[PDB]
Design a protein around this ligand. Structure first.
Ligand SMILES: [Mg+2]
Ligand SMILES: [Mg+2]
Ligand SMILES: [Mg+2]
Lengths: 239, 239, 239
């Protein structure tokens, strides 16, 4: 896929909501049809049928499958066999081996556990990888913590650390870099601040969970002693 | 040991103060009997005798030995032979080899140097490791610096970086994660802030240097769009 | 070279300005004669001739060459053959191999790309390495970003992350640690804050781009429950 040619507004849509697929595609640059945490355990078989029955443009659609080693991932790959989709998102990505076993698909690795953070470079370097994303909430959950954000709304340090880790690992191997979802949908101010910062440090994408967030992300990724790299910054802004 | 079943308030007690061992055990969840920096060089032989003569519960007691390759560590392991203790804390932990040479003991690696930070994952993965701790002051000292904290009391960035490094490395290999001591004993407000943050990101323990800090830590580790990990956060709080 | 014995004020001087070499040497502790980004592409041959024609003290002078694999670096090493300089600075340093191929010269690796950050420990450990520096602007540029600093002037998180990475990697292998240039020359307050912090965490050097910054750096590297490392901090201050 030419995912880099699409804009920065990517949108999760649970795959057991086929009635919303067309609206998601209309709102977003890329749709992530979700078979993992956005779909209840009992609804995953229905989500797999909808995946086959209600196709979206495979050049602008990614499918988030279930974690490596799970029975659900096996059922997901069987369902995907009857689709035109070529790119999957791997949640709880924790090793190069988990990515490699998804070949010949293209893989966006979603790092959201301590093991994935420790192994981020190996995951990014794996041959099927085309992008890296991070997830603050599963990260904190699997660390045994209870909140990813400080009282003032900023991420706690370990989340900020993993965010930088994933940005560097993705960029070191020429992969797309995707920034974490902003869970507080009505907090447009906070999303605006995060997406502006993400654009400023070189993320390619901010992933959204609600279509109202897509215009905020698209606008944030547009701009408002000098050495050679500072001129590159100015040329990036013009672009 | 079932160190994870004990509470989060761990307390250093210098091993040349056997008159305080019982009070430390009464105040804390786990006692770290210290043969390293809490005991003056000339007092380490006396500390080793006290270690043998005044036993604490080996299921709730860790012994901090001296650094790898030192004559003091050799004397420590000889003294420990005449005790029931099974878990040691290794200061200036800098390689998997330093941990492995302490087998068959269980090892809590205290990372507090640049080399230890760079090798944190290898240290965490070593077979004897059961926990990781970090130390800001020895870290800054061995970097050649002069203070670990900013004017406003927050840790400087390299200390925050190592803290996250150790949390991730410990959690990636299922080890206990221990947060650094708060040296300003009377600064209860600052300890409260740090321990609340440590609990929120998934540290298991905040280590203390004064028994007055234990109630602050124990209280801080108790709690005051929703996806699956956010529900895990709420379940962790209830637990 | 005994670069560690020189003070902390290092100063870039473009090598096509030989009329300024003597003033740079008078102002700074160490001069970095620059064949890379400080010299326009068309002016690099003239800079190489000036490098040979206008010598500075090789015990207090480093030469920044061009990036590995470039034709310019090849021309730089040919020009350096007719000089007494023994230490080079490698920009966009990205692998141990790039450092090793500069043997038998001493190498200060300037890490300023995502790949260099991911490989910082391997770069620091390479046998020719004698120091590590980081560069925020090329880092942000090669990440595809557009600014290294927040609205309040602080570095964005990924720059802070790479700064700590380089400090730890340098110190883990006994290399000099050099902090990034402060591009806002007239912002003496901001330089003072950064250099004080750099000195406090154990950087050896803050690199400057204007001679007016050298006194600020030199002054900042002078100083204005207690365990063993806190006493080391106090002894470092007295020293
Ligand atoms: Mg998740
Ligand atoms: Mg220490
Ligand atoms: Mg540069």
């Amino acid at each position: 896929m030419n995912l880099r040619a699409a804009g920065p507004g990517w949108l999760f849509c649970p795959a057991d909501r086929p009635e919303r697929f067309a609206k998601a595609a209309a709102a977003a640059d890329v749709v992530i049809l979700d078979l993992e945490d956005g779909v209840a355990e009992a609804q995953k078989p229905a989500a797999r049928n909808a995946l086959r029955d209600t196709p979206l443009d495979p050049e602008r659609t990614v499918v988030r499958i279930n974690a490596g080693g799970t029975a659900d991932q096996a059922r997901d790959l069987e369902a995907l066999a009857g689709t035109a989709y070529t790119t999957v998102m791997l949640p709880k990505a924790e090793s190069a081996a988990q990515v490699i076993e998804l070949a010949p698909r293209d893989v966006i690795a979603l790092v959201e556990t301590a093991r994935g953070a420790v192994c981020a470079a190996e995951i990014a370097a794996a041959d099927p990888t085309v992008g890296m994303m991070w997830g603050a909430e599963d990260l904190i959950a699997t660390l045994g913590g209870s909140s990813s954000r400080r009282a003032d709304g900023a991420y706690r340090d370990v989340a900020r650390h993993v965010r930088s880790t994933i940005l560097l690992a993705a960029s070191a191997f020429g992969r797309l870099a995707l920034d974490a979802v902003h869970l507080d949908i009505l907090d447009v101010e906070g999303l605006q601040e995060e997406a502006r910062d993400a654009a400023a440090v070189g993320f390619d994408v901010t992933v959204c969970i609600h279509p109202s967030q897509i215009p905020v992300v698209r606008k944030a990724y547009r701009p408002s002693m000098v050495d050679s790299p500072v001129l590159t910054h100015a040329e990036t802004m013009l672009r």
